A and B are shown apart, each in its own frame.
With several copies, the nearest count.
Chain A
Amino acid sequence: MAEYKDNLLGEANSFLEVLEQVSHLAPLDKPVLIIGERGTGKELIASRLHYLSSRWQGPFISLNCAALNENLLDSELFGHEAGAFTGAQKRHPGRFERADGGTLFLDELATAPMMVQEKLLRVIEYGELERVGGSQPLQVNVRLVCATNADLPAMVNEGTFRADLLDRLAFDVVQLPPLRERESDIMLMAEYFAIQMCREIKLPLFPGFTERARETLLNYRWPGNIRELKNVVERSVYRHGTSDYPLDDIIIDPFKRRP
C-alpha cells in the first residue's frame, strides 16, 4: 500500500477521472475488463490496478492470448503433472497456478481460439480446476484482468466471441480515453517524453520543440496513441541532431524516407 506513482501522466484529460473511478475498483477482486485500442497504456493501467491493492504483495502476473503451440498453451493453463506426456521430466506448474492470491492479466481476448475460449470458460471464475494429468482438483484465488481493442459486443453478435465467457467476464469495463482526443495531455506527455529522453540522450539540454512540431503533431492522427508518440519523439530527437535551437520538424513516418 505505497504511492508508487511510477508512470503516471496525462491527467489533464478525463483519463484522470478514469483512474479515479478505477481506484474504487482497485479493492475489488471481481472480474475486470479494459477497453481501448492498442498503444493506450492498458498494461500500465493493469499494473497500476494490481499494485494498488496491498495484494500486490500477492503474485501479480500477465498473460496474452498468443497461441504459440496450442497444446503448450493448454498445458500452461492446466499445468503438466510429472510424466503426463512422453518425456515429461517433472511436474510443470500451471500458468494460473503460478499466481494464486494475486492479480492475473488476460490479454488478446479477441485473438483467442474458440476452443481456447471454451477451455478458459471451463473455470469461468469457477476457482477450481485440474492439472494436466492431475489426480485431484485444486482451488486457487486470483483476480483476472481482461483487455482488448475490439468490440466484444459486436463479435458476440457476430458470434465470434463466447457469450457465456463474456457474461462470466467483464464485471467492470474500463474504456480507455481517446489519446487522439486528449490534446491537452499531449503537451504534458511531450514534456515528459522530452525529460525522459534528456535522461537517456545525456545531451547538454533540451533545445525545445518550437511550435511547428506541435502543429504537425496536432495534424498527426497519432494511430499509436501512447507507444508511437514516444517512438516518434525519440526519432525526431535523433534526427534533429544538434540541440542548439528548439526543433520544429517532426519524424512522422520512418517507413517513409527521411528526405
Chain B
Amino acid sequence: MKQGLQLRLSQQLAMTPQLQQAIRLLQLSTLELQQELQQALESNPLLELPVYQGETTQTLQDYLMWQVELTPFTDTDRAIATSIVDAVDDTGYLTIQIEDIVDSIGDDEIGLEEVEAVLKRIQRFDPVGVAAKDLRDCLLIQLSQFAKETPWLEEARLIISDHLDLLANHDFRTLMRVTRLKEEVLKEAVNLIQSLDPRPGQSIQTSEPEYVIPDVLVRKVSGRWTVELNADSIPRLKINQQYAAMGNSARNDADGQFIRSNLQEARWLIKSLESRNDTLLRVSRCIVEQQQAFFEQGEEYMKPMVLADIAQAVEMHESTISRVTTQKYLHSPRGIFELKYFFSSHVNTEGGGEASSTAIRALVKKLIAAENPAKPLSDSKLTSMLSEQGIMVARRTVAKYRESLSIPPSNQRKQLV
C-alpha cells in the first residue's frame, strides 16, 4: 500500500445504534440510579430504638405562641394575633399584607384600625419590629425601643423615615443636599443605623447540616494522589444462588425459559453496571491527572480545561464523558466540587496564555476584595490589574464575571471609610 489522504472511497456505517441500556448507564443518576436498580430488582427475582432525640425546640414560633397566651387579648384579638403569627417569615417579617390579613379574617366587624392595633401589639414584642414586613418600620420600632438620650437619634429617625433611597445607593452627597445635615457628623449616625440588627428574626433559625455524600474521594497524602470512589456509595448487586440452582432442574419449559430470560437480563444489567463503574473510575483517574496540575496551581491559577481535552484522556466518546459528568460529585482534601466545575473557558493571555474563566474570576474577586473602601476599583481600572498580571483578558466582558460573583457595582460599593 502507501500513505495518503485521498478522499473518495467506500466505507461502512458509524457506531451501531439503539444502545439504550448503555445510554442510561453513561448518565449518572446517583440515588435515582439506586431507585431504578431497586425497581429492576423488584422486577427481576434472580437478583439480590431506645435512644431518641426527643427535642422540642421552640423555634420562636412556640415562644411567640406562649407570649400570645401570656398576653391579655380578646378572643377576636387572640385570633388576630394567632393569624399574624401564622404569616411570619423566618427573617422576622410578615409574609402577607395587612389588607391580605384583613381579607383572611373575613369579618365585617374586623377593621383596619384593629389590624393596626394588633400590629402595634405585634410590634410590642421581643424582638422589636416583629413581622414588620418593612425595613423602615422595623428600624423605626427598634429606634423607638432605645432611649432618646443617645446622640444623633432624631437625625437617624429622619433618615430612616424617607432617606432610605440615598443610603441604598450610598448617595452621601445627595443625602446631604436633601436633608441638609451636618457633613461627616452623619457618619456616626450612619454607623449607628448600621448597628440596628437587620432581620432580628434570623436568630430564630437554627443551623441544620447539609448532608452531602460524595462519590469519589481523593487524598494525595505525601503526593501519590490516588482517586478512590466511595465504596459505601458504590452499588452492588448479587445473583440469587438458590434461584440459579433451580433452572436446569426445572421440568417445565415455561419456567425454564423464564428463568433463562431473567438470568440473561440480570447478567446484562450487571455487566452494564460494572462497565459504568469502570468507566467512571477511569474518567475520575484522568480528571485527577488533569486536576493534579490544577490542584497544585491552586484555585487562583487554575488551568483552563476542555471537554474534548478530557475525552482525549479517555477512550470513550465525548458524549459518554458529558453523560458521566452529569450529577457527578467528588471529595478532595481542598473540598468537594462537582466534576463539571473542573471545565472552564480558556482566555487568550499575554504571551499566548489561555486563562481559565473560573480562575480569572477567582483572581479578580481576590483583587477586588483587596481594594480601598473609599475608592472602589473600576472595571477599566481592572484592566490595569490584568496588565499587572501579565496575562491578557477581556475587561469589557469582565463585568459579566463580576456580576457572576454577585459583586455590587463599584460606584454602588462606594462607602465612607
**A-to-B contact residues, CB < 8 Å:** 57-59, 69, 71-72, 75, 80, 84-88, 101
* Residue in B closest to A102 when the chains form the complex, CB atoms: B352
- Kindly provide the distance from the CB of B9 to the nearest chain A CB, expressed in whole angstroms: 6
Chain A CB within 8 A of B223 CB: no
Interface size class of B (residues with CB under 8 A): 10 to 19
Chain A CB within 8 A of B209 CB: no
Taking each of B3, B7, B351, which has the highest tally of chain A beta carbons within 10 Å of its own beta carbon?
B3
Q: Which of B210-253 contact A (CB under 8 A)?
A: none
* Residues of chain B with a CB closer than 8 A to A58's CB: 351-352
* Residues of chain A with a CB closer than 8 A to B335's CB: none
A222 to B165, CA, bound (A): 88
* Residue in A closest to B1 when the chains form the complex, CB atoms: A69
* Residues of chain B with a CB closer than 8 A to A85's CB: 3-7
* Residue in A closest to B3 when the chains form the complex, CB atoms: A71
A180 to B3, CA, bound (A): 45
- Kindly provide the distance from the CB of B317 to the nearest chain A CB, expressed in whole angstroms: 13
**B-to-A contact residues, CB < 8 Å:** 1-9, 350-352
Decide: A57 and B351 in contact? CB cutoff 8 A.
Answer: yes
Decide: A84 and B7 in contact? CB cutoff 8 A.
Answer: yes
Decide: A80 and B1 in contact? CB cutoff 8 A.
Answer: no
* Residue in A closest to B315 when the chains form the complex, CB atoms: A90
A58 to B353, CA, bound (A): 9
Decide: A72 and B352 in contact? CB cutoff 8 A.
Answer: no
* Residue in A closest to B5 when the chains form the complex, CB atoms: A85
- Kindly provide the distance from the CB of B349 to the nearest chain A CB, expressed in whole angstroms: 10
What are 22 A-B interface contacts by the 8 Å CB criterion? Answer: A57-B351, A69-B1, A71-B2, A71-B4, A72-B5, A75-B3, A75-B5, A80-B5, A84-B5, A84-B7, A85-B3, A85-B4, A85-B5, A85-B6, A85-B7, A86-B5, A86-B7, A86-B8, A86-B9, A87-B5, A87-B9, A88-B5
A72 to B3, CA, bound (A): 8
* Residues of chain A with a CB closer than 8 A to B1's CB: 69
A58 to B2, CA, bound (A): 34
Q: Which 4 A-B pairs have the closest CB atoms?
A: A57-B351, A85-B5, A71-B3, A86-B7
A241 to B37, CA, bound (A): 69
* Residues of chain B with a CB closer than 8 A to A75's CB: 3, 5
Decide: A101 and B5 in contact? CB cutoff 8 A.
Answer: no
- Kindly provide the distance from the CB of A93 to the nearest chain B CB, expressed in whole angstroms: 13
* Residues of chain B with a CB closer than 8 A to A101's CB: 352
- Kindly provide the distance from the CB of A51 to the nearest chain B CB, expressed in whole angstroms: 13
A71 to B7, CA, bound (A): 14
- Kindly provide the distance from the CB of A85 to the nearest chain B CB, expressed in whole angstroms: 4
Decide: B352 and A57 in contact? CB cutoff 8 A.
Answer: yes
* Residues of chain B with a CB closer than 8 A to A87's CB: 5, 9
* Residue in A closest to B308 when the chains form the complex, CB atoms: A90
A58 to B9, CA, bound (A): 42
A101 to B392, CA, bound (A): 15
Partner of A59, one of B2, B6, B7, B352: B352
* Residues of chain A with a CB closer than 8 A to B350's CB: 57
* Residue in B closest to A80 when the chains form the complex, CB atoms: B5
* Residues of chain A with a CB closer than 8 A to B351's CB: 57-58
- 10 new A-B contacts, CB < 8 A, other than A69-B1, A84-B5, A85-B3, are A57-B351, A58-B352, A59-B352, A71-B2, A71-B4, A84-B7, A85-B4, A85-B6, A86-B4, A86-B6
- Kindly provide the distance from the CB of A25 to the nearest chain B CB, expressed in whole angstroms: 22
A85 to B2, CA, bound (A): 10
* Residues of chain B with a CB closer than 8 A to A57's CB: 350-352
* Residues of chain A with a CB closer than 8 A to B3's CB: 69, 71-72, 75, 85
* Residue in B closest to A56 when the chains form the complex, CB atoms: B351
A88 to B6, CA, bound (A): 10
A58 to B352, CA, bound (A): 7
A1 to B401, CA, bound (A): 31
- Kindly provide the distance from the CB of A162 to the nearest chain B CB, expressed in whole angstroms: 24
A72 to B9, CA, bound (A): 19
- Kindly provide the distance from the CB of A56 to the nearest chain B CB, expressed in whole angstroms: 8
* Residues of chain B with a CB closer than 8 A to A80's CB: 5
A80 to B6, CA, bound (A): 13
A58 to B349, CA, bound (A): 11
* Residues of chain A with a CB closer than 8 A to B9's CB: 86-87
* Residue in B closest to A82 when the chains form the complex, CB atoms: B312
- Kindly provide the distance from the CB of B136 to the nearest chain A CB, expressed in whole angstroms: 57
A80 to B2, CA, bound (A): 14
- Kindly provide the distance from the CB of A236 to the nearest chain B CB, expressed in whole angstroms: 40
- Kindly provide the distance from the CB of A53 to the nearest chain B CB, expressed in whole angstroms: 13
- Kindly provide the distance from the CB of B153 to the nearest chain A CB, expressed in whole angstroms: 62
A84 to B7, CA, bound (A): 7
* Residues of chain A with a CB closer than 8 A to B352's CB: 57-59, 101
Taking each of A57, A69, A75, which has the highest tally of chain B beta carbons within 10 Å of its own beta carbon?
A57
* Residues of chain A with a CB closer than 8 A to B6's CB: 85-86
A59 to B2, CA, bound (A): 30
A75 to B9, CA, bound (A): 20
A33 to B1, CA, bound (A): 34
- Kindly provide the distance from the CB of B209 to the nearest chain A CB, expressed in whole angstroms: 46
A126 to B312, CA, bound (A): 27
A57 to B390, CA, bound (A): 10
- Kindly provide the distance from the CB of B335 to the nearest chain A CB, expressed in whole angstroms: 31
- Kindly provide the distance from the CB of A75 to the nearest chain B CB, expressed in whole angstroms: 7
* Residue in A closest to B353 when the chains form the complex, CB atoms: A57
* Residues of chain A with a CB closer than 8 A to B5's CB: 71-72, 75, 80, 84-88
